[PDB]
Design a protein around this ligand. Sequence first.
Ligand SMILES: [Ca+2]
Ligand SMILES: [Ca+2]
Ligand SMILES: [Zn+2]
Lengths: 320, 608
Amino acid sequence: RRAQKHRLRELKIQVKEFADKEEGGDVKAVCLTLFLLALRARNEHRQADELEAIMQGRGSGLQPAVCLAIRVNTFLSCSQYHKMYRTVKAITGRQIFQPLHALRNAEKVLLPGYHPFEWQPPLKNVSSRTDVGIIDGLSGLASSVDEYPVDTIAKRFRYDSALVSALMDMEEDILEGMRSQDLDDYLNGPFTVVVKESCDGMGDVSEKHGSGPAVPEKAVRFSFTVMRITIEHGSQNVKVFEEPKPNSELCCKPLCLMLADESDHETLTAILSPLIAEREAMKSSELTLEMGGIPRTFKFIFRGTGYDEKLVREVEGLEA
Amino acid sequence: RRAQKHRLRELKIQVKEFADKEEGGDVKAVCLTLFLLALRARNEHRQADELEAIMQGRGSGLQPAVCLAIRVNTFLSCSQYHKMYRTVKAITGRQIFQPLHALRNAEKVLLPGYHPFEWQPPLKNVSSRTDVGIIDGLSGLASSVDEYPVDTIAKRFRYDSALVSALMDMEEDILEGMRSQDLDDYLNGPFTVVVKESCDGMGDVSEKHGSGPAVPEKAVRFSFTVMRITIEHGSQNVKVFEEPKPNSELCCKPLCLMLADESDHETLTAILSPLIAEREAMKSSELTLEMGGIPRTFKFIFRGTGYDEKLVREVEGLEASGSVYICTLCDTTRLEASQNLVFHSITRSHAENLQRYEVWRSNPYHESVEELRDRVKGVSAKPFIETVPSIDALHCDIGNAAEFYKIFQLEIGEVYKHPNASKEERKRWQATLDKHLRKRMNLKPIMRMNGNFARKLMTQETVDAVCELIPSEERHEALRELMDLYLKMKPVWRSSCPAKECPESLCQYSFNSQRFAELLSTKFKYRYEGKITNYFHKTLAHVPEIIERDGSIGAWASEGNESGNKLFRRFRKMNARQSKCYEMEDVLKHHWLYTSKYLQKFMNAHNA
DNA sequence: GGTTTTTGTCTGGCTTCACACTTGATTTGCATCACTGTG
DNA sequence: CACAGTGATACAGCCCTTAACAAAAACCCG
DNA sequence: CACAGTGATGCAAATCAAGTGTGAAGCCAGACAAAAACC
DNA sequence: CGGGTTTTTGTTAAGGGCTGTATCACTGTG
Ligand SMILES: [Ca+2]
Ligand SMILES: [Ca+2]
Ligand SMILES: [Zn+2]
């Protein structure tokens, strides 16, 4: 490297002084172009195509989004992925899989708290901030010695931000659906979105050791799916996206996981009150989101169909 | 392509004149150097390495062996690997990975039954064929409706085939160790191989649907691992290998997997008889096997230590498990063991148990039931598996920790002043002990005691948190000193090399044992007058003798077999066919592939 | 209209990739089989 | 002293620019 | 009428290795000649 | 045999950016 730099001590100087004049000072692009022309003069076309793919990250590389998709949908843990990446490094020599920090950087885009959303009218009792991530499910429940004892752990997502992330994960799907029925592409009619929220407790979940309250060995999950999305066109309505597998495990997007008891009622109400408040506030509100270069509005219709009979009774008044 | 030549016309002239006058005339090469310099300055070393690889010899494409190694060690299943390979191919273009059929072809080298071998003394009662794979564990037992009913599903490797597969998987480690010992390389002396047999029966395995016998919901695994390999040189032998993690899940090798009850002696013996026949046949023979192009001979020394207390009682011939004869190494009654607590001797063996069964059956002296049992020292059944006298470290620790838990539960109630207590009092003692244990050291209450619970409860903070609930001070000091004694005792029978990393502890074990025994006999007369646990008996009597006889206690423990049991459920649920007739075979093959070591060095290529 | 950029061509000569036929010889892809797991 | 995870976080290693100087290996010829 | 596995088996589709003479395409030489977006 | 010339490789310190590994309290099969 040092010998090449010392021999090439001037060539960089005049190529950069020309780049400052002809282009602006982008030495990498002009050097790549000159290499491509040199290869063409030497008559290698497949090699030039491969180099172009490499510069575009197609011939190799496996972009971090693709690597994260592989790791997540292959049910591979982070440590196992690191082992596989390290051994592929050592053997092949190139970088076929991306590093864990790159995966984690690409992770933040899909998680809630990255896109900007504005409400009109603003949601009642819901903050207008657009960077809320994983918040405590207790909603700041009083946990001193003087009040009702708390023995639950709950991490939950704000309902509106979670809906924004779920809608943005299917941006291409919504565009394709709107293209399929020969509608426009920049149409910004008010979308009508129906969401099936399902809550069901579990049993025989092993309580762990470690610092925390006397947590019972029961877990209650809250989740929602996006069933269908429609736009208002002309006098009637037309569907854009319909889930082909409504009962699959790939559509039951989680919302709020608390390791509490289903039979216990006070803690259940305390933890699930904020979500119901947000849902009631959003029942009559309009969500604005920058959907692929054109702002479009959203509407929400909620159906609580995914409850078993015992929880339905325990919630909606009925006894036993 | 054409509209970009008129920015480069005014530059290629000086580029090529410089190349002619200084480099020699090459333009593509000098531009390669310039582009590498620019890319490395821009901090695009990934692209720089890709360009270097593509311009140099193309290293694209992984070997089927390394693909299989990744697929097995990264805990992956065939369908997930297939979709990973499909997406990688479809996106990258070139086929970096290798297909499932190629991986399946490449995995026949490691599985037993593909390499040639022979025995210099022809083994008795077993075929010399060298192309046997997974053979039925039932050994062709009669399944006719008229015969004794069968309810077991067993798939099994032949013992010598598994041994030769393991040995020439071990081949390159053996060669590397031989080089590292400053010896020759092509020497072919009588190798001695020491292997460890571990057997344990599990529970709560979910029986599947489908055609098959009335199989129970219990499983028994029979696994072995290679510990030491030695070869003779002049007047001494050299340690050609030594297992670094004898208790890991990467060393125990599955050999015979069956779904049968541990205590169902009928089917247990029915399935394990061929294994003992093979062990007896090959315990007095010699194996000739090529090793890197040069034949080498193998001797075998066989030891059984991976057996739990109940399984030793069942297969060695002791009464049931409780009896009055408590130890599996010495013939001493529970009361006599409770009064002596110090001095004993290891005096049981498989041949002694066989002859004692012969005496019990024939009754050569015309004597009654009680006196005959007294003469036969509790042997009331004929043994069928040879096991050496040893101690299972994990179960010993678990039992000792449970006993200490009960001692704390009693002491927080001061039973020494209240000889009579009620069930409500005992329940309240248990509840307060659990609450304060949680509050102080933060352990949840459990009903079956684990080993992590043992390790966390065997601390000084434990006796601290207990004694802050005991009003008296004499109990405080007694518990503290007993706890210190136990912590000084534990390292000896839990370390891989007791004679290396714990010399002072090993030396002081005897004095600590005497102090512990007399402390119990004096300050704990309310628990240990006329009765003591077999695990305390073992720890206080037999551990130094076993150290002197063997070399280490704990390297032969059942930690590896427990880890294999952990792997068994994962393999059954994600890496095996979900049918009652092929699941066991698939689990056996995948577990053998995982425990293979040729597929493990590939994932440690980063240190090369 | 001026100015600059962007494509187009010119003929002889060079290299570089695809194929024209045939017969095997592999490698690779995907459907089938009776089952599980969370209730 | 069971041993291989399990994932987020933070610090260390390696390497790029500036520019002038220093230690070291290969031929030429008196 | 849940749905994503679970791995071995087996047949069908795809790719290729062997022989040399073609075509078909990209590019090199330095120079001349029309379209198109800002004034 | 050794200056003399030419070429190869490294070195000093201030910053930026990617990459690798140790650390934290825990898990499970018992
Ligand atoms: Ca349920
Ligand atoms: Ca067991
Ligand atoms: Zn004993």
